[PDB]
Subunit: 264 residues, 2 copies
């Protein structure tokens, strides 16, 4: 058995910065694109476009990173039996695009699991992001399973959770995911956050978690689509990180360019 | 009439660094890929793989940058009547992938023009890179016109050329390109180097070249696929840089990730 865990694809807010909404939305709250790295459309949200502030979408390059990983999985003859993701839109969109690369977007249905959301300390303010519910994600042509019953529903998450609580819930939900998939297909894919690669696998392997300082230092080193594999040996039943069946993916930036500022 | 000039797409040597050949070629000089940003194949070269050292290919993401620019030109109904490129492999490959995005890769044939090569001061050592000739570029599936007669052949390029010589030949070749395309289609695309955006357009607009120190500082600000448009104004016949018909393209990096170093 393998549990694959990866980070979401490039997120719009990092590329376009503090006022990114002004580069993506007009005075009427309607989506506009101002750069070729912006998609042709974005879903409508209950609270309007400002719901994107705490829950940004992926970019065109994020979609491509995701598709390339799915294509690499297909090329390696790695069959994915179940796919789970964090409720963050960037995670759902990444999972969908991995499925497209895998040629499984019209077959597998993504299980949206709020227990996979990252440490809530990293959310701005006093409330969680207003996640798009699975019904609406499905309506937005993201291949989500609207019948999936999550292990940790949204209202079981606390905005004030400790590091200990985050790591422990990551372990809990990952065990529950493994248990409900056991003997129903040997490979499980989690599409989530930088912090998920270790949070979901540390205690699974019998290991002691790092302190939160060392943890955060590590989290900052996980790139978009950063991918790991935790395999269950079967001679012992012990889970261990092992080489993924796909190669890493590394690329550089294409920085902002204002031809007027530079060529005049 | 518009003259479009853009920089090539992401280059393999920049992403994978000083020892990139060791990540792309085995002990028998055969191409291997070790990252999902490396293509599935590279052409065989007369001098073998070491000919890539001074003439690196684009990456998978470089291909995608190029395709997205071609797609944007198509979507905006910007018709490209002729495409020229520098003999550098990265420029030829970019031009090919722009054509794919344009859906013109089975219609237009790229005119390889050594006059479009960048300032030769930036070449290592005492000889120019061993460029793949048009016949071989066509054999490597790169939509090149093997019948094109260049204005400045390879052996007309000086290894020790001055800044003034570089700027002046850029002006010369661009005039000859415009003249041979006159009344044969209004839009011309040059796919070349960071330095080409200004070198090809400066004197065309009746402007005085910058000093070489200022020029180099500017060239470092032009990203992959950085795109400009020099338009011939109807009332006067004066050429001037104007807003391109497509949006800019900006994205961030996906940095190197070694799961063993980071998660163990």
């Amino acid at each position: 058995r393998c549990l694959f865990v990866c980070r979401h694809g490039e997120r719009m807010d990092v590329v376009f910065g503090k006022y990114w909404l002004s580069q993506c939305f007009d005075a009427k709250g309607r989506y506009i694109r101002t750069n070729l790295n912006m998609p042709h459309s974005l879903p409508q949200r209950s609270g309007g476009f400002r719901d994107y502030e705490k829950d940004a979408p992926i970019t065109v390059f994020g979609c491509m990173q995701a598709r390339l990983v799915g294509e690499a999985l297909l090329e390696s003859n790695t069959v994915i039996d179940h796919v789970y993701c964090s409720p963050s839109l960037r995670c759902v969109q990444t999972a969908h695009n991995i499925l497209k690369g895998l040629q499984q977007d019209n077959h597998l249905k993504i299980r949206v699991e709020p227990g996979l959301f990252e440490w809530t300390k990293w959310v701005a303010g006093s409330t969680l992001p207003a996640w798009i519910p699975p019904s609406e994600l499905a309506a937005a042509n993201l291949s989500v399973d609207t019948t999936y019953r999550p292990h940790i529903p949204v209202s079981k998450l606390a905005i004030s959770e400790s590091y200990d609580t985050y790591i422990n819930r990551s372990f809990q939900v990952t065990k529950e995911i493994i248990s409900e998939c056991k003997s129903k297909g040997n490979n499980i894919l989690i599409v989530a956050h930088a912090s998920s690669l270790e949070a979901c696998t540390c205690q699974l392997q019998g290991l002691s978690p790092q302190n939160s300082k060392d943890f955060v230092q590590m989290v900052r080193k996980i790139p978009y689509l950063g991918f790991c594999s935790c395999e269950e040996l079967g001679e012992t039943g012990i889970w261990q990180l092992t080489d993924p069946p796909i190669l890493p993916l590394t690329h550089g930036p294409t920085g902002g360019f204002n031809w007027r500022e530079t060529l005049l």
